[PDB]
């Protein structure tokens, strides 16, 4: 009696996936590993560094720019970048615009096979006389990497395109058995990778990792 | 095993009264909709324990 | 120990001796005096409260018994010590409101 | 309570500094504890308050998931156009109430974010939820608080 | 015969039989309503070929929620040696049934220090908390009780 | 913990995490080896438990040990009852057992 | 719980009014076998069986769900009783 | 470019240690735990499903010349581990005839083709002079814990249904230790320690557990509209 797997989706940002019925205990058995994978192992892009021309360090402030360096960094951590080319590793985007104009993420100079999923993302509000010149470093990686040239500032990088994963395993009954399992799995992503895609990738990572048990190399058992 | 599927239909939408003595105030009797369970024990919501 | 002793739920060795016959329903012993005595065991017996009072023999055939030694465990006794329950591995923590 | 409560570490010993980077250095050397009262530049601020800045609540939570920091440790988080000094656990509780009542702003009005949640504060939250929001919504909030409370109380240790 | 299969010649159930609620422990018949059948019944008895009879079923069955494996039986009668009972009763049967009750949800456990409680959940061994050597704990006690 | 080394095993990364939180809580003296920190915890009667569902450790140590527990004559089997209809009293005409 | 209970409370000047109304309406739906419902087929309260979705057997759930639509009219002395009964029996035998 | 080394250490059929390193940080748990779950629960096996004893009408009886009561007897047979060599064989009824002043063990069961007793020295009953014990012990294949009260139609009228714990797996622990590629110090060395009853090999158990997990991961392949 193979279980049904149901999918409910709103946009590319969010989805619910329900697997029922499962045998007793299996809701968690599937639920936990997938979640662990979904939060870390799923590949994506993140800003790992930022350099400002007039800024000596993260805690400084920029004349003619309302928001401090740290706030701008916070606006950079929400930047969603997609690499269309599988060979691409590191890409450096440049933004020079100093005008008294509202600045969005759309203003970054376009690069081949690099797509901005959120062009309307706000960075800073510049006024008359204000000047902003920046080079941001975008890299490919997995999970969350803390910040830990010369004036280039290290940035906490969120690689995981999956923003949040939460699962609930609830009791269910098929005929006689009242102890069966219903596994509900909710996934919030940034739109770079659809929830369904992230789920599939996680499952695949797990399977491939189960393949590693295939080729035994013996060793002796120790005794005192 | 078809009978229980019928009982599930009987109690659908219905509620039962649970009461614990002594009934000191009115909340010592409350109405819940029953969820059929295996076992001989009544399962009670934790939050209502205080009133009861 | 002494609880089970004085409650006389269990059988003890009346005199130094050696045990001839052992099974579920009886224990027959011979003492130094050459006294042959058959102790019948009460098995699966309904008490007032409905609990089963059951004597389980702890000694095998051809064993040396000393006066004061336990022949057969009474109900709820393990080796002549009062057994009211089981010893289990407890973890003291909250678990999911259960 | 266990998740909304914040840590006080005495190893910092209330040492005042000038540059935040000095404080980070001293922290990395193993001198000053992660959460300690510390005066850097103008005002008093925690070490981890400077070290970790989060653009998203679920960024902070994602970090916690990776074992970067705990829910009790105190950090800096941007929530609803406001820079907050609250711990990940209080952000979590905030989202718990918010998702439960399905109104984020009103939830932000109901909660007391700067205190560890306990009997009376939770009681007050419930009453205020009964007033400001529906009766049934309040019931849902109750069930949510039940679930998460139990959940955390299991793994709290 | 489906219901009668476990009864011996006298009507008593057989030793070692597994009886659930409703199964007959001892058969008995007693005269119904001064030998007066209701007229509406009398015709339907004839439709089915004279099921009409002097006696009705008073037999002792197994009460709901009860039952187990039959262990002992004791039958005593009037007009037999050494056996005499209260006035008016012809005979008396006793069925001693045994059941071995495993621990279940709702049963009361207690330590000698006064901590008492009922089992509200039975977890599968994989769900249990365990030591690093893999051994699972038997019981999870709430610290708030202390 | 002693035969752990004899069988070729060290301390779990999870045990490290638990020990970090434990010295944060003040149950173990900082700077000492995890080998010894776990001994300190064990001396308090607390160990490191793993949650069988998630495989992750319970944050902070948990008291475990052998406790003698009794099963009591009160038993749910004898205590459950239900009625739709049944006998009524002769005179009072109220439901009767 | 139950959907829109606060609104049902809002529809009346006393809770016990709502109770009486819902109860009586349930009696109506039962006696006439639910054909007199003011609910459209897609608005019909459904129950999940092994076979599939079927009409919810519960009359009170129905009465409440009808009352929430505001299509029902309630109050004291709307009509005389017997006339109402005969009219309802004429419309829905 | 690095595929994790899978190492195996084994002592007899009872116990084994199974290592996989290096793994990504956290994967020691990610792989380790759900395997442990499936091991302790879902691994098929064999256990005594029934007992007949001549002139014994029910479990609560007591056999003349035998020290053990029938309950202690079935409690012993609960510990009997039986290994089926042929995968097509779902049931065996062992026979044990005995008498005289003999101490019966599991070795005393009449041998059956492709059916091996892994603990023949297991104590069953102590008989004295005059004692006679004649048993038929039905052993079946199964999975998990099936209580006696769930029994179907029994072979004989004096047949005594026995609680059956099928899982061959006695214990599962796992250690996750830090390991190095030498640049990366944070990696995961996973070690699964498995004790079984001898009916099934720890490697066999581990393998079919991994198979159960894979076959479950399969279930995510075919979505449905909601």
PDB file of C-alpha atoms in Angstrom, chain E residues 3-14 23-27:
ATOM      1  CA  UNK E   3     -21.937 -19.726  20.415  1.00  0.00           C
ATOM      2  CA  UNK E   4     -22.121 -23.164  22.035  1.00  0.00           C
ATOM      3  CA  UNK E   5     -18.853 -24.607  20.694  1.00  0.00           C
ATOM      4  CA  UNK E   6     -16.863 -24.051  23.909  1.00  0.00           C
ATOM      5  CA  UNK E   7     -19.393 -25.566  26.330  1.00  0.00           C
ATOM      6  CA  UNK E   8     -19.237 -29.151  27.606  1.00  0.00           C
ATOM      7  CA  UNK E   9     -22.181 -31.557  27.954  1.00  0.00           C
ATOM      8  CA  UNK E  10     -23.491 -29.988  31.174  1.00  0.00           C
ATOM      9  CA  UNK E  11     -23.337 -26.560  29.533  1.00  0.00           C
ATOM     10  CA  UNK E  12     -20.320 -25.288  31.474  1.00  0.00           C
ATOM     11  CA  UNK E  13     -17.472 -23.803  29.425  1.00  0.00           C
ATOM     12  CA  UNK E  14     -14.342 -25.914  28.883  1.00  0.00           C
ATOM     13  CA  UNK E  23     -19.384 -15.574  25.227  1.00  0.00           C
ATOM     14  CA  UNK E  24     -21.317 -17.969  27.455  1.00  0.00           C
ATOM     15  CA  UNK E  25     -19.544 -19.114  30.616  1.00  0.00           C
ATOM     16  CA  UNK E  26     -22.449 -21.256  31.825  1.00  0.00           C
ATOM     17  CA  UNK E  27     -25.712 -22.098  30.071  1.00  0.00           C
TER      18      UNK E  27
END
